[model samples]
Target: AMSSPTRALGFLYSCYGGVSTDLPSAYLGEINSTTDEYVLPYSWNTDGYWGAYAFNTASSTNQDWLWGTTYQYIGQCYLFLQKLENAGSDIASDAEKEQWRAECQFLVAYYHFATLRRYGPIPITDSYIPMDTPTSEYNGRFHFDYCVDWIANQLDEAAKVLPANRTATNEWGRATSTIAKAVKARLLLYAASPLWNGSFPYPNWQNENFETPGYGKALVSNTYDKSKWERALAACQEALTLATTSGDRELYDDDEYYSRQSLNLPFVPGVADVEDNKEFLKNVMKMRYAVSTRESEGNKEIIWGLSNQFDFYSRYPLRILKKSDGTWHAGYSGVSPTLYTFEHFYTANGKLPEKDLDFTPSSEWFESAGISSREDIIKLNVGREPRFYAWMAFDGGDYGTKFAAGSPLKLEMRNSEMHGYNPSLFNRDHSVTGFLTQKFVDPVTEFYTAGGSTSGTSAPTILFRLAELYLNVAECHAALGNTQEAIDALNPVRERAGIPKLTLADITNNMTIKDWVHNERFVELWNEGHRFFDVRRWAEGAKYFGANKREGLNAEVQSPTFEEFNKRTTVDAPYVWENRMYLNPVFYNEVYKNPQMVQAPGY
Candidate 1:
């Protein structure tokens, strides 16, 4: 089901792409550009295209695909659910029938939750409704709490029927009880966030005159409830328990696996200075693939994933790798990390460079006077945490492991025949920001130039893994004021990341357990399509992404000397936050026919 639907086991092992891909995540300030082939409007161009935040229900570019695909899946789930129920005992045993039914329900719950995140309150399609069914039998939208509880209950029931593990190699991405509970935990956490949980942020956010149990009720709550946090805490704890105990899932901590990797002929025969502390780098290598490794390869961290939407080499932003003998290889190098991401990743001590007292200050952070792995690259790229180096590729950074095209690979992002701005005939083939991203790009992948073929290292799109569940538990516990318990849960993630674990002493007057947990999630979940929803849920999108806050190298400023290409400049485009951005309006045509369906506030 990962690549597409399968009738073999109903909804078992099935997943769809686009849930956590570049298009949506890029707008939230991770990647920096789409190839010019999108022919995106000039203002709507680049990875962190600011135009995305300016709302328009009628604007079809960013709106229609999500609405179309989400509902399409919901319809499929309901249709398959009915089919599974009607099949005779010869088709499947009582156990298999219930298991398949529960699996489909898991997908149904997920699609509804996905839609809820997009449009505030969605019309619940609990069971399949015929096209001819009376409109009165179904309402326009359910209230936020009702939808949460309904989805939550569905996952709980599904968890009882889903298997803890699908050990068969062919069953790589199947929905298990662990996946059901993990998604449920995340759903409840989102439900408890400031945007939807407490008081309604939007003054007039409710449907009008829809014929339902409560005819025209407010879709949002008016009062804050501390109990929502408590419910979230329980769900998080239960999910963590199920994943670790029954699911046999754990953080991928096997550094020994990296030691056994076969290093192919590199773009260059590797330099000694770039190969220092090989064991430590090997540990970092293991952390790099923790999410990218296939389930069949014994990476227990991934809770669920699709076949492999993430492994498209073009999405990785890799640059050309040259050997001393005149051979060179390249990935499409289509996207990049913004200047916002440059500052977001943590320093080696697991503290942000801006906040770490021991780190260099404001302008000195990028000065050439300081030390770095490669010459001419600023200190800004130096001394970052393992996960930062593992996930990101920059001017001086090593390109993944030795198995990558070149071990001490520098993309020559400023100006060069290989990775410079507009190196080829296509203007969009380079990194818009000077920096590139390496996550989900297999370390062993060789994105060869045309005469040779690429190494077959494609990977699946990971939706959930054990690390985030630990972060979720920590966040819920910290919110509940269980500081010690929170740190206890959070340290596993930090420790595996090759950073120092948190202590009660680290929780001081200014930075509380809550901030600590939040920053951890920010670092742990960067570019995985969680940042957009996380900031939106916390009601902090304005401070994070609104206004002219995005930053990047002057991508258009390349001359032979590469002088201004390294200067950090505030990006120029639009991304002002209106309260309406909290939820996209129901598509314009969706409300035209139903007088009862009101558009989202600020539309």
Candidate 2:
């Protein structure tokens, strides 16, 4: 018999559920690709580029996409779950019901998490809110603690019954206990953040002025609590314990040898001595396999990932060309990679690039003459972790080939007539930062083997993976003042990336263990829909979303000979990001329709 519960679970992946495009569009603007946020006319009016402006206004139109499209579906999910329960044992057995119930719970919890991350505390909608329910009754936001506890508790219930990992090949992307645990860890971690953990991170934050008569509490809590971090830490530990218990689900290391070969550059670590460096290379191979493998190839490192049915590449894929001939491939450089993201990658020796003994900041290029030669470009780009090569596409970089016998793609972003690329053109194929992203790209398969063809490879959009659990534990422990425990947790993630692990000696007056943990996440999780929330939670907008802070590499050289490439100025361009984005202002329509739904701190 066909399963109704499976169909209900499948609803979560629809536009309103896990596959909503708007959520990614909203935060994608925060990142500046190789140069700056894509400010072209095509992207100008979308809600994503405007940051909070898309939804902050008093108009009903601004709030509809989020409130109506995304929020309305939560109610639908609850109703569907109720219908499945009513169908009884004749339609579905007890075990099937239990499994489906967990799936429903996970979706409901996820919908709430999505709303919570955006607008601060949100009204709990565990059950369907009747369409006729009074606005006052349904619109009032709950306390941050209450909202998070509900979500965390729901995840716990789901994790207990859901399978450790989907066993049936047909059920590859279905919800699992492991996925529930990972999401639970994330929920608790957010609850423990500065913005929602019983108090605001900024001392000056107050909600009295912003609150309306119907809405009394601040969008977030107004007190400091230490227990939140403890809960978060415990969740992370348990999630990892579950990972170990479920044997087939360890970090991906299928191509350990090739991964090591990829990271050991001639300019960097030279040659690897397999006998002495076996452990070191194995760690490096793990991180490489996790991110590089295809969606169809099945990597255990990914705890929860979107199925290939999701057309992720259509929106975020990079456009590449056959270097042998200027043939357009099926791709688009829609998302820009930032220089900040580039600098976030650690040196090969596992130290911060800025502080690395062997590395020099790009700002000193003119004085040091590092940018004055072709060797300089290779020197700067090479000698970083394999993850760097995996994620970033830069000028002269050997991005792998799409067509057989075609030369490996070299980024030619210099503003010239050369066949490589030029950012100044109106074409959608070029990168803003003069660099492209190679993270999800399949080098062998062309986006479209022939023009107008839609056939191409699709990669899994990873939502939760094994490495994040370790980082979550590190952050929670660091906040609890358990420095040694925190450092111990963070080292494995670093080691897997072939980077040096942190030591007490690296803890400067300006950067503490917490700072190191946070920075490691920034590097480890760049452009992965994590940074924006992390910035908001830490209340570190001044450091992250500051004025004129969005900068990208404006490499000015056209199809450069060695002399021309060096003659080009690697200047910083204005990467547009506004400070008002720290927390999104609740839309005016949300406030106007229901006085109980007050706006966030700043409008």
Candidate 3:
């Protein structure tokens, strides 16, 4: 019998699928971690450096859980492979058996890459360690180069056997050659990144006393390597080829949805004459479609996505209704955008308004942007870009969901508004930055009476998509000094965002194509759990996620008027990237007992 199906399902749902994980990973960038996004003195028996990163708390449940979960899945895959090796020729055919084996290998390969992304270096458990194996024979973490090569080589082997068309039915998030290649591209890019290739978070981050016999001398080399980029450039091209089915996996733009967007209610509210700039409205609709749609339902962009992102999608609701008195209600509204996010959106010309010489603002414009003293909004929210409006719902911004209201409501997020804070038992369900996210939220889904979302209508947790691949290609090329090609590569995402494509003319002394590329990812992929890894890989986490980098409006003034809510101050736990934060700390048991392990630098 195919008992592997039950075992695999057990792994996926309880451990893998449910890796039921979404509440973590926002602390590094984008979402506020300590005060705005969460509440109280979080404890788990130690010094609270959540001031460091959300997951770096004494509890470290966020860190250890993922570390343990990935190994659990990897072990499960090894068990299945062990089962396969003992099987006869009657399972289906040679092709089917090999295909099953390849899928397991792909899952293992992907997890290894995921773990490497999380913790810097990890042991490559290619096969199941039997009960008879000796304790001294246990494996330890390999060198970075060895780990990267081992993972990619495994993906390459799996790529030869995976199906190109296993995209339908129950195979949406399942592994395919396309998925393998896509992962391979990201894997190579991560390895080629400054973190792995040359730049270390700490300069002398080598294994001084290598306890393991064959573990490499340095876990992360401090040398700069350009040849890795050359390899990554090719791997990305390979991803481009299969991800598109050569053409099918183009970026998701629901032209039908955009073409019929006859209203402009979901933008900077109280604005006039929406009919004039109908193109902006269309662009907003296109941006909405990119994040809110499912793969089979017109979103071709999701190369790999998990439907189990309900935990995250659940966070998007700004309010719920009771339908009795039919008034303000509770929702997980605290995971608001950071101050960095409010101003990160590009202008209509595809240039960051702050960077655009043609567009200048008042002293209070980008700095100290508060909504309390304003009407619908300040000038900072207007005439910027579609992505800003598409992802974030600012003061007087429209919530596309009716929330039982007959029409979409303009959010009056001052203090006691439906979307704002209320000093009730559900006080935690309040906006932190006076802004709410609409990216994973279904605009049309009913937030009617009984509860926030009666039905399960939310977008999947898109782990891999075409936009990232394009962005990755651009990132690789830009770092490699191929500025023009980087601009060319990133233009597609720009066009999709309904902004003018990047040109050399747009690049200033302060903002080059490389700078533009980094900002684009922040804007396009803000809350989808990317900024944490990307910033570290680029070696900019200390500069970018440092204090004063991401400020916020005073959402703590629960009963304050508009003026109090609009006062921009350093939110309770702004991004304070410490030195030891680049690679997450491996769990304690993995370190204390194992002689081969080296503790993370900062910890």
Candidate 4:
């Protein structure tokens, strides 16, 4: 499995550090990004079409393609170690070789962890095994815990060898000791989460038809591993201590998280404000983007990213216009934020304005907590809470308002544009979950409605950030019965969101301190694949995923009955989704592929 690209790129890959190669874009992210907004550059072939919707079954899903990509990526790690070993001290100076070895090991370990996170136990190949050996000879399916340990060991190696921000330029966006520490911390946190905790064999879980063949058994037990929480806390603290030492460049200035306000400029009625915008550049990364490339550079916001080999084609252009019409538009994908996520962004006062719960085809629901009119909503609530806009998509929000599609820069057309948004396809409303997230798109991209070229935007996907370290610290503190530290850990995020902070009573009333931490994670890490597990950790999966909806934009509007709303809603999920659903069944073939691995309980 150790291939040549792996060998050739060994030094560079290890030195540069690339682990994951897949994009787990949700159905909405994948569709709205490609078909709705039309920014990505994939082949857009039939396979891409099928892969986009292949959620449950592997038959049409991108899961296999991603899995293959992962395998190849891992192969690169395999060959790097091969070449390093064969270099036998000649690969570079002994000092260089040792560091290279550490980096390579760390890369390999993270690769395995990344794979396990998605696929559960997998064929965790390290040193190349002999092909002549039986297929079963490749049965190296260690449990999830072992994989975490392996990644920890790799981080340990990297910590010893990876210089502390010493190679910033060459290692631009590459994994560093800090990244390794963060990854380690994240892994520990997940282990402590209810999804994989050494708690009941599958706490807050149940089987779904596609994921569970048996459908009604405990797939994993809530096997309590107390040290899991301790380990997570220690790792997060270690990461925090190391990360805080970086210059302001490594961690964004406080202004980066705040300082933006509503334009408040007078717009000629019926005239959109499309030029001379201020908040548009507030989120700029490196240099502001040009008119031609629709691309911005030097995105200091990107802590770590790997895309299209670092070309202009990597990440999706932030706010973008469809190339067909030359008009303006963006997906209602910044669908409304979920109530669960929204609460986390605020303080205990509930002082934050209630976000709009309705969106239209053209305009959006601008009202919030009794405010009327789009302009009034913006003036009243938009300025203070930057994340209110940052985290969700709403009509009249900042994105796509100032820039014309690729204006300032020109939008380009590609064959991929042929696949336009078919309202017939996925006519999802903005209020599906009551919030839309906007972290991935360039807010300045023009809105193109009719198929002209769109502006280029560069918003990279986040792998890890230091702020999360504070959150995990809070979680760990809660676990250790130190509720205040946990609350303190959560306060910064709320404060930055311009929401009020919590008090001791809020922490206690909110259930365990751990519950608050879990809710905060739901808020902070909404769409980036953190929720499903957080749902498990807090045992709120069934509550929220199944059928929990808090009050709406107003107290007068009582929370609707779950059954009554289910009949009217477009999607009807369980009111109390069972716990087994948390641990997805081991894809049957994967089990056959590695017999040494026992599938999670119900599989």
Task: Point to the candidate with the largest TM-score.
Answer: 3
What is the C-alpha local distance difference test score of each model?
Answer: 0.66, 0.58, 0.67, 0.46
Per-residue lDDT over 423-445 for candidate 4, one digit per residue giving the tens place of the 0 to 100 score: 24323212333223444444344
Please report how far candidate 1 places residue 331 from its true position, in Å.
4.0
**Candidate 1 lDDT, 329-448, residue by residue in tens:** 555554557666777677777777877887778677566633334555666776667777777776644564532343545556665565666644435465656676767656665533
What is the model-wide C-alpha lDDT for candidate 1?
0.66
Off by over 4 Å in 2: 1-16, 19-64, 198-218, 256-289, 292-298, 308-334, 361-379, 401-406, 419-429, 446-457, 556-580, 585-589
Model 2: number of clashes? Answer: 10
**Candidate 2 collision pairs:** 33-336, 33-337, 34-337, 34-433, 35-432, 35-433, 198-223, 330-448, 350-499, 350-500
Give Cα distance to truth, residue 52, candidate 1, Å.
Answer: 4.2
Overall local distance difference test of candidate 4? 0.46
TM-scores for all candidates: the values are: 0.87, 0.80, 0.87, 0.68
Clashes of each: 4, 10, 5, 66
Reference-based TM-score, model 3: 0.87
Q: Candidate 2's residue-wise lDDT over 426-482, tens digit each? A: 343434445556554443333333443322345456677787888999999999998
Candidate 3 lDDT tens digits, 1-603: 135545434443332442333333333222224322222222211332344355334333335446677777788777766766666665445676677778888888888887888778777888877767765566667777788989999999999988765545653356778888888998999889878877776766666445333545667667888989999999998898788874358798775563443333454432343678666776777787787777667788877776554344324545555555556555566556766676677866677767665555635553333345446565567667788777777776566644344355566676465566665744455665667776655556455555344423557667778998899899889878888889988999999888888887767688878788888887887766676677788877667666555566776565666667777767554345576767777777777666666777766
Which 10 consecutive residues of model 4 have the lowest summed lDDT?
Answer: 286-295
Superposed Cα deviation of residue 185, candidate 3 (Å): 1.2
Model 1 Cα shift for residue 96 (angstroms): 2.1
